[PDB]
Each structure stands twice: as structure tokens, then as C-alpha cells.
Amino acid sequence: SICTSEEWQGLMQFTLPVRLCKEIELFHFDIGPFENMWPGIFVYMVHRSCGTSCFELEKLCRFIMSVKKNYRRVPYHNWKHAVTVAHCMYAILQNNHTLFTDLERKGLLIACLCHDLDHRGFSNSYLQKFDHPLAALYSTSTMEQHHFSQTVSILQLEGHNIFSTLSSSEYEQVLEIIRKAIIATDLALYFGNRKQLEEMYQTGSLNLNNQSHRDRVIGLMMTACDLCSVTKLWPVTKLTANDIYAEFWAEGDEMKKLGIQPIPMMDRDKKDEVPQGQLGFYNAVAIPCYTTLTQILPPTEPLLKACRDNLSQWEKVIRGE
Amino acid sequence: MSICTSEEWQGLMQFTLPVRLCKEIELFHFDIGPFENMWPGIFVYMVHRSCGTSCFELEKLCRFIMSVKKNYRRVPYHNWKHAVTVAHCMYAILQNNHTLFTDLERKGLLIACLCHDLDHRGFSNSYLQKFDHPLAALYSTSTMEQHHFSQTVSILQLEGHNIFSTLSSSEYEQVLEIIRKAIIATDLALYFGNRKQLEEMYQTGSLNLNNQSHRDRVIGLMMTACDLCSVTKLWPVTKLTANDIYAEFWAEGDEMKKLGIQPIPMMDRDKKDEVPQGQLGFYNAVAIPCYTTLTQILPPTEPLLKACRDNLSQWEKVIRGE
Numbered sequence A: 001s002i003c004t005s006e007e008w009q010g011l012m013q014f015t016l017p018v019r020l021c022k023e024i025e026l027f028h029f030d031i032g033p034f035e036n037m038w039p040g041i042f043v044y045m046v047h048r049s050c051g052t053s054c055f056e057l058e059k060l061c062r063f064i065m066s067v068k069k070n071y072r073r074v075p076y077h078n079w080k081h082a083v084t085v086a087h088c089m090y091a092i093l094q095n096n097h098t099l100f101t102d103l104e105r106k107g108l109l110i111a112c113l114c115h116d117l118d119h120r121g122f123s124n125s126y127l128q129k130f131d132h133p134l135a136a137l138y139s140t141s142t143m144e145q146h147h148f149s150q151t152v153s154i155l156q157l158e159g160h161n162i163f164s165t166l167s168s169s170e171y172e173q174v175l176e177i178i179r180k181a182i183i184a185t186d187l188a189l190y191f192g193n194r195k196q197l198e199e200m201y202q203t204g205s206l207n208l209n210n211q212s213h214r215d216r217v218i219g220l221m222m223t224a225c226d227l228c229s230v231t232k233l234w235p236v237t238k239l240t241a242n243d244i245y246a247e248f249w250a251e252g253d254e255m256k257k258l259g260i261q262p263i264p265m266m267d268r269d270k271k272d273e274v275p276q277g278q279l280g281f282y283n284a285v286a287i288p289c290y291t292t293l294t295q296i297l298p299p300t301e302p303l304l305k306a307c308r309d310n311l312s313q314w315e316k317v318i319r320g321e
Numbered sequence B: 001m002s003i004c005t006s007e008e009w010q011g012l013m014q015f016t017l018p019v020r021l022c023k024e025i026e027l028f029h030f031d032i033g034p035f036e037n038m039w040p041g042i043f044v045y046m047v048h049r050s051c052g053t054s055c056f057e058l059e060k061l062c063r064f065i066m067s068v069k070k071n072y073r074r075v076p077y078h079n080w081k082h083a084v085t086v087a088h089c090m091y092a093i094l095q096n097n098h099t100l101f102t103d104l105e106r107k108g109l110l111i112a113c114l115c116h117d118l119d120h121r122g123f124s125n126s127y128l129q130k131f132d133h134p135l136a137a138l139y140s141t142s143t144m145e146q147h148h149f150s151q152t153v154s155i156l157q158l159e160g161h162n163i164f165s166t167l168s169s170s171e172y173e174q175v176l177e178i179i180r181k182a183i184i185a186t187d188l189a190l191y192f193g194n195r196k197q198l199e200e201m202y203q204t205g206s207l208n209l210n211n212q213s214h215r216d217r218v219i220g221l222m223m224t225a226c227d228l229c230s231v232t233k234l235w236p237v238t239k240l241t242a243n244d245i246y247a248e249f250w251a252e253g254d255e256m257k258k259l260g261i262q263p264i265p266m267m268d269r270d271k272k273d274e275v276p277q278g279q280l281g282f283y284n285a286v287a288i289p290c291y292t293t294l295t296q297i298l299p300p301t302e303p304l305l306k307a308c309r310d311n312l313s314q315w316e317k318v319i320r321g322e
């Protein structure tokens, strides 16, 4: 997928409505109601965080419109999710201004937009269990290796390599940041990452000039952004939930077409247990993520608070309220 | 005994409870899990709300709290989280039956709950006695529970930690007796005779509350109900805490396999299949009887029994492959 001459020139015209400017800096901001602004909203966030002279604008608008093209029309892992994850990374880096290099803020905003590129709405287990081509290629973190492969594809396209103008080494530094960040969105790898950071922060040996330590903190940040649907206002959070299950149930529907019972999270015949499942996901995954994050990055506390507020709302739904 | 630093207890005095949580704390099913940084301050609030703001001096109290956390170990279940969970359930029981207990007992039972598993290594009473651990020789029966009380007194005897200094020396030994008895009653090996005795004293109608020997038995049942209160939370919380319990059990079951001895199925991670039926039998024989007799004695404590029943249906739904 390469964007036409027709698409990206309109993106160079876009100026963000000034009434938002302040509301976009909030952690809990929702990009939902501004669909035709999401491509330019990403341009805005790149210019604010990295400077307008960071990328040359012609190359940048092409890359954003091609990446958008390569997102399938699935309920949840779509173009809206990519810009929602990218905004959370924007808010984290804006509130941790003096912690990350220019190169890291470049890659991470790029990595978040492309972290789910060409998602087909299926979990890694589905591709591996039922012998998908990509699973025969990428044995572990199947889609995550595909997501990074899809990004490198677009970057190698003509007029798209926004990283054309870095040092030849500096560029190979960016791709490692982008790869490790996208690989870190594999939720299965999150538990080892967050437990390692737990012991490290606790023992005090968490060293922020240790590169592998930096990559672990980046990975937790990628997880925090990937889950940021739990950190919006409860009206927004409850709505994104409907998108998540519609895609889960669709994968489980394919599981039934054989003759197998999917896990209850992917069974539409078990919608009643959804509020309990959310309460369990927040306590087992979400709360640990943003708690270790806030411990490492104190400015990211609004995420932890918003996640706690959303957790009590699910508890009220379970408790008959 | 690891003493807490000054920055630890200083930040505790400045802590304020978020307005919204003040209401949710009073509910039996309240789950402290998602508010880890708030756990020490939550205990301050529960002490203040039940025992008064002038009860303990905030300086010594915040020292005792943060030092008790430091002496709780990093085992999968019997840790700092478990202490505040048991302490909260006691607060809820005490709040809903406030004037039924003295002011000295509310001070004793809340403090004893916070310290009831101090310095837990993650090994049951049977392990330490089988492999003649030194503590099994110093404490013949109720091995860890007697040590927990010794750990509790060691913290009180630390410089500037004694929150009971301002009691009359009669009431000093009095509250220490309530605390010693409460921490001993958390030995589940004693609950079964004590619950059976309370059940008979109730149905015949001879259970009297200012009968001191009866009073300790009722406090013992309250200490048991608080120790098991994870069965009284919402289903997803109870499953997550069940994983904490089995993670520690199975670790002890591995050590016996290193010594060539098959552990009991409860501590055998190769018998994970029997987990739902093992929970079903624990509820029927232990948990449900505990809160049933407790609700007969203190009817305000019912929501524990109903929530314990709610999770009994879920454990039965799991055994039927659902």
C-alpha cells in the first residue's frame, strides 16, 4: 500500500482546531469524535514533541497516509487503535520531557502508530494453532514480528523513508527502538518485563543509562499505551470495550466453525461474564502495568488514577449499579 | 527487626484518603488490591475511624505501621497485602458491631490483624515440625502463630514504636492478651473445635458475650473469618487470591520433593486438576461454616456469608466445566 498523490497533500493542509490544543495534552483525551482529524492529529503530536523541522513534511505525510491504508477494517485492532496508542505515547513523552533522547521520541511515536500494522483480528494463538503462513514464518510473537516487518516495508518505499536524513548508524538505532517497542506490545512478554522492572526498582539497581534497562522501561510504556482504553473516561472506556469483544467473539466464532469451544473471553454466548472479566483484567494486568509505570515515571500517575476509576465502575456494574 | 526509615512514616502522616474511597472502605467486599501505595494510610484511617483520632499518637503509630510492613516477607501470599486485607475485614466487622466490643479490643484486634502473619517464610506448621526447624522446637504447637506474636511484641518494644505506652499497665498486659489470643486463633488447626464449640453454645442458648471465655471464642471466630475473607470478595478477586495461595503452597510442595517426599495434594502443583474440587471442599467444610456461625452470632456480618456463598456457586460452576 502506497498512498496516492491525492491523499497526503490534503494532510499538509491540516491545522489542528485550537480549541483542542489544550485538551489533547490530557492523558484521558479521546480521539473518537474526530475521525477525519486523526492523521493530522498525529502530525501535530510529532511537531509538538519532536519539532516541525524533525521530519521533512512531504515524506511524513506520505508515511502517515500509507500506514493508515495498511490497517484492516476490523472492530478493534484498526487505524483508530493506532492513533489512540500513539496519543498515549505522546502524553507520556510530553510529561517526561527531559528523560528520552530525540531519537527515542521519534521512533516511539512512529512505533506506536505502526505497532498493529496489518492486524487481521486474530490472536497469536489462533495463527499458531491453525497453521497460518505468518505463524509458519514467525514462530513467536507472530503478529508483532509482522507489524515490524510491515513498518520496514513502508519505510523502504520511495518518498517514505522519513529516517532517510539520519546517520547511517543513527537510522539503525531507530529501527531497533521501533522493533523492540513493537515486539514489546506482545502482551505475553509483558508479565516478564513488568516483573523484572518490579525487582529492579525495588532493589534500586534500575539504572536509566543501562540501555537494556531503558528498553524494558520502553516496553512497559508500550504496554501502557496499548492498554490506554482503560484510562479514558468511563463513557469512552465502556465503548472501546464493545469493540474489543466484537473482534474476540469473531475469532471465537471461527473456532466454533470447527467444533471447538473458545476461551470464555472469545465466546459471545458468555456476554454476561464480561464485567467480571474486565474486573479481573484490570486487577491482574492493567493495575500492575500503570502502577510499575507510575513508580518508574511519576508524571504518568493520571493513567493509574483513571484506570482505578474505571475499575470501580466495572465493580459497580457487577454489584448491580 | 527491620526498622522503618523516617521518610517512610513521615509521608504516612501527610497521607490523605481520597474522598471516594472513604465510602467503599466500609463495605465488607472492599478489595484493597488496586491501591498498593495507599495500604499503610488505609490502616491509619481504619484505626482512626474505629478507635478515634486521639487514640494513638500519629508519630508512634506511623512508625509501628511502616515497620510492620518491613517485617512482612516477599512470599506469594502471606505478605504485606494479606495483612491489610485481614485488617480491613476486621474493621468492617468492628464497624458493623461497634459498641459490642470495648475500645481496648478494637485497638487490639485491628493491630493483631495487621501483625498476625509477621515474618512469614511461606511454610506451614506441618513443614517446620516435620523437618525439625528451630522454631518448631521453641514453639511446639501453633508454631508460626506464636512466633508472629513474638514478632509483634518485638516491634512494640522498638524505640518510639510502643503505641500502647499511654495505657494503664493493667490495660497494657490486657491488650497484649487480646493480641496474643487473636494471633493464636489464626491457626486453622484450632478453629474447628472453637467453631464447633460456638455452634453448640449458640443453639442451646448459653452463649453469653460478657462470658470472658466465650468472648475469646467469638473473637477467635472473628479472627478466622478475617483470615479467610478472600472467599468473601467478588469472584475475579477471589480467583486471583487463590492463585497467590497456591503459588506459595506449591513452592512448599517442591521443597518436600527435593527431599524425596510426596507432599499433600494441596501443595502438589502436579494436582492442579483437583483445585476446583479442593476449593469446593474447603468452602463446604471450613469457609461456609465459619461465616454461618459468625452471622448467627453477629448478624450484621451477613454480607460475608452471602459473598462466601456466591463464590461457592462459581467454584461449583467450574467443576461442571463452565
Ligand SMILES: CCOC(=O)c1c(C2CN(c3cc(C(=O)CNCN(CC)CC)c4ccccc4n3)C2)nc2ccccn12
Pocket: A187, A226, A227, A228, A229, A230, A241, A244, A263, A264, A265, A266, A270, A273, A274, A277, A278, A280, A281, A284
Ligand atoms: C488478551 C488481552 O486482553 C486485552 O487486551 C483486554 C481485555 C480482555 C477482555 N477480558 C476478558 C478476560 C476473560 C478471562 O478469560 C479471564 N481469565 C483470567 N485469566 C486466566 C484464568 C486471564 C486474565 C473473560 C472471560 C469471560 C468473559 C469475558 C472475559 N474478558 C480481558 N479487556 C481489555 C480492555 C482494555 C484493554 C485491553 N483489554
Ligand SMILES: CCOC(=O)c1c(C2CN(c3cc(C(=O)CNCN(CC)CC)c4ccccc4n3)C2)nc2ccccn12
Pocket: B188, B228, B230, B231, B242, B245, B265, B266, B271, B272, B274, B275, B277, B278, B279, B281, B282
Ligand atoms: C488449610 C488452609 O487452607 C486455606 O487457607 C485455603 C485453601 C486451601 C487450598 N485447598 C485445597 C484443599 C485440597 C484438599 O485436599 C481438601 N481436602 C479433601 N479431603 C478431605 C479432608 C479428602 C478429599 C486440595 C486438594 C487438591 C488440590 C487442591 C486442594 N486445595 C484448601 N483454599 C482457600 C481459599 C481461600 C482462603 C483460604 N483457603
Ligand SMILES: [Mg+2]
Pocket: A115, A116, A143, A144, A185, A186
Ligand atoms: Mg498487537
Ligand SMILES: [Mg+2]
Pocket: B116, B117, B145, B186, B187
Ligand atoms: Mg497465619
Ligand SMILES: [Zn+2]
Pocket: A081, A085, A115, A116, A185, A226
Ligand atoms: Zn495494540
Ligand SMILES: [Zn+2]
Pocket: B082, B086, B116, B117, B186, B227
Ligand atoms: Zn493469615
